Amino acid sequence: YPVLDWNDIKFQDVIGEGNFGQVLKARIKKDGLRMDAAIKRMGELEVLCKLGHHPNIINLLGACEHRGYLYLAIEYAPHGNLLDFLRKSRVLETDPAFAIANSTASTLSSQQLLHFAADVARGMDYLSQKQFIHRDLAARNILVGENYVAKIADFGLSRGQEVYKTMGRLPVRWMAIESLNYSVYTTNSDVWSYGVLLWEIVSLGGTPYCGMTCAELYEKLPQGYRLEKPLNCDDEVYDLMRQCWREKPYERPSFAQILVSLNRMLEERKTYVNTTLYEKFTYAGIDCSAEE
Numbered sequence: 477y478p479v480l481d482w483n484d485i486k487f488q489d490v491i492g493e494g495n496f497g498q499v500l501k502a503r504i505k506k507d508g509l510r511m512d513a514a515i516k517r518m519g520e521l522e523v524l525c526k527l528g529h530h531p532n533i534i535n536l537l538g539a540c541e542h543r544g545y546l547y548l549a550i551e552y553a554p555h556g557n558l559l560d561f562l563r564k565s566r567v568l569e570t571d572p573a574f575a576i577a578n579s580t581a582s583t584l585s586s587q588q589l590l591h592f593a594a595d596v597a598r599g600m601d602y603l604s605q606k607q608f609i610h611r612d613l614a615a616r617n618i619l620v621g622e623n624y625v626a627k628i629a630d631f632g633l634s635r636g637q638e639v640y641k642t643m644g645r646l647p648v649r650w651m652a653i654e655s656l657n658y659s660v661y662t663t664n665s666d667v668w669s670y671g672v673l674l675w676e677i678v679s680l681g682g683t684p685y686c687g688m689t690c691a692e693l694y695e696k697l698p699q700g701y702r703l704e705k706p707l708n709c710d711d712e713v714y715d716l717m718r719q720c721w722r723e724k725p726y727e728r729p730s731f732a733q734i735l736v737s738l739n740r741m742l743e744e745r746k747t748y749v750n751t752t753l754y755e756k757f758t759y760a761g762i763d764c765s766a767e768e
């Protein structure tokens with residue numbers, strides 16, 4: 477582990493709280509440089525030390541025991557979590573004069589949205605090769621870092637130790653059928669969750685299955701029910717999502733193959749996510765009561 481001097485840290489605001497600890501924005505000095513960090517004040521240390529160097533996995537900058545407490549200095553992601561970032565892009569909601577004037581539903585382009593999807597895939601490929609299973613992949617656990625690079629994170633909810641207050645049943649909407657029905661978690665179930673995350677990206681942060689209860693998922697998913705294609709989505713992108721949600725876990729693509737499909741889409745001249753406004757346009761719904 478890299479060890480940080482207590483005196484090398486200037487703390488600022490609290491940016492997250494929980495029964496188990498808090499997260500503070502801070503400035504640290506490391507090696508020679510002064511830098512931003514998010515410091516978790518209270519395992520997690522070992523995991524971040526192994527994987528964090530990957531540019532699509534949130535990194536450990538350093539650790540520090542001071543008095544009773546352990547402090548983990550985590551790479552600061554200035555743009556916050558991807559779900560909120562996606563929703564803030566809904567410029568017809570958040571800046572209608574700009575949205576209408578520019579005939580646009582988002583400040584994010586099709587390519588930027590695909591780059592986020594590719595970033596998460598790249599990170600998941602590496603993580604799955606290192607034999608980790610995420611178990612709670614969703615846009616709320618992705619950070620948008622320096623230079624808009626997406627970083628995979630985990631805020632502790634799955635371990636009963638959340639920082640920042642999620643409705644307990646909310647993760648059901650990202651769970652593979654085999655996780656729902658048999659409590660099985662594998663790389664293949666992480667791929668299913670990934671598909672739901674891709675759907676989040678394309679829908680600019682819609683609540684998956686908005687208007688449906690979790691109970692309805694248990695009944696309908698094994699009947700072949702799946703998230704509908706967003707109106708703004710090319711068939712190719714939706715086909716990729718649908719691959720992620722094949723009933724048979726062993727028929728889902730690997731993260732490496734996901735990344736190859738996305739890069740092939742990124743490389744073409746064609747536009748895959750339509751961000752244009754038109755009459756009767758509507759965003760995928762958000763159900764705040766399913767979430768909070």
Ligand SMILES: CNC(=O)c1cc(Oc2ccc(NC(=O)Nc3cc(C(C)(C)C)nn3-c3ccc4ncccc4c3)c(F)c2)ccn1
Nearest residue numbers: 491514516520523550551552553556628629630632635637
């Ligand atoms: C505006 N910007 C900000 O507010 C902002 C806030 C910000 O806060 C944090 C973000 C992430 C983490 N930590 C993690 O992501 N942990 C993690 C990752 C993984 C992976 C590598 C397996 C995915 N496993 N575990 C992980 C591993 C073990 C755990 N055991 C118990 C509990 C949780 C655990 C999590 C954190 F502590 C603080 C960072 C940057 N910007």
